[PDB]
Design a protein around this ligand. Structure first.
Ligand code: D3B
Ligand code: ZN
Length: 257
């Protein structure tokens, strides 16, 4: 059992998960003076089918929007990949206040939230369960979210939260293309990393967008409005779910720009 509280939070994660102190841990601080431009990086190509949208689930520490991943209807290609990767999920991370909330930071700057759009290597592997722990198994697009104007594209997601207010609650969530949440420029950083929460597998090639997306202070309050408790128990709001940044351990962050 793990979380983002005092006793079960990021600090204690190595007790159950020793890879927490590994050499390919996420998230990281992207230092733009220390990044290395790479001319071999292809553009990011996302092509999602809105019909693959499936379900929204309250997982206690966060909420997930899951996607049907039986075929290649919704794929990521390009960037640093020769393989095609299949969309399975998106979710968010946020903080207790507007001051923090993102997982990744750029030149020490914390943003208010972060969108993760996650994919698995369907070219090399047969399932998410198989891919999830492979070095080249996962591809996650990270988009930093800056507090400002209300993001209208965020609407269908925020509206759906009313149906999944407490832990374990789930509801159908259909006909949504999550590339509509992505910024207009897909200029990016890329580095070898991990899942940002248990089980923390070093299976993720991160794609971090240069361009942020907006979110209002009230849209953030909707995230924090979700409850970590089961129905009938007294309310425990999901205040924050971001992991602190991790030492790069000689890894190199590549820029596409
Ligand atoms: C037990 C187990 C096995 C396999 C996976 C994928 C998980 N992961 C999750 O529950 N969430 C998650 C976190 C990230 S993130 N925050 O690192 O971008 C990306 C994709 C996600 O699915 C857990
Ligand atoms: Zn995440």
């Amino acid at each position: 059992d793990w979380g983002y509280d005092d006793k079960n939070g990021p600090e204690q994660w190595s007790k159950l998960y020793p890879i927490a102190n590994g050499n390919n841990q996420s998230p990281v601080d992207i230092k733009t003076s220390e990044t290395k431009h790479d001319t071999s990086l292809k553009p990011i190509s996302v092509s999602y089918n809105p019909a693959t949208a499936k379900e929204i689930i309250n997982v206690g520490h966060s909420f997930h929007v899951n996607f049907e991943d039986n075929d290649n209807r919704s794929v990521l290609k390009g960037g640093p990949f020769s393989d095609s990767y299949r969309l399975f999920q998106f979710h968010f991370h946020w903080g207790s206040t507007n001051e923090h909330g993102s997982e990744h930071t750029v030149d020490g700057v914390k943003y208010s939230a972060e969108l993760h759009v996650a994919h698995w290597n369907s070219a090399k592997y047969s399932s998410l369960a198989e891919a999830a722990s492979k070095a080249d198994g996962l591809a996650v697009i990270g988009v930093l979210m800056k507090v400002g104007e209300a993001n209208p594209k965020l609407q269908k997601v925020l509206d759906a939260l009313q149906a999944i207010k407490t832990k374990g609650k789930r509801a159908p969530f259909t006909n949504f293309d999550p590339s509509t949440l992505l910024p207009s420029s897909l200029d990016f950083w890329t580095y070898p990393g991990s899942l940002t929460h248990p089980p923390l597998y070093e299976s993720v090639t991160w794609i971090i967008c240069k361009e942020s997306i907006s979110v209002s202070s009230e849209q953030l309050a909707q995230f924090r409005s979700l409850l970590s408790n089961v129905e009938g128990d007294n309310a425990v709001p999901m205040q924050h779910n971001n992991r602190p940044t991790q030492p790069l351990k000689g890894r190199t962050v590549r820029a596409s720009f």
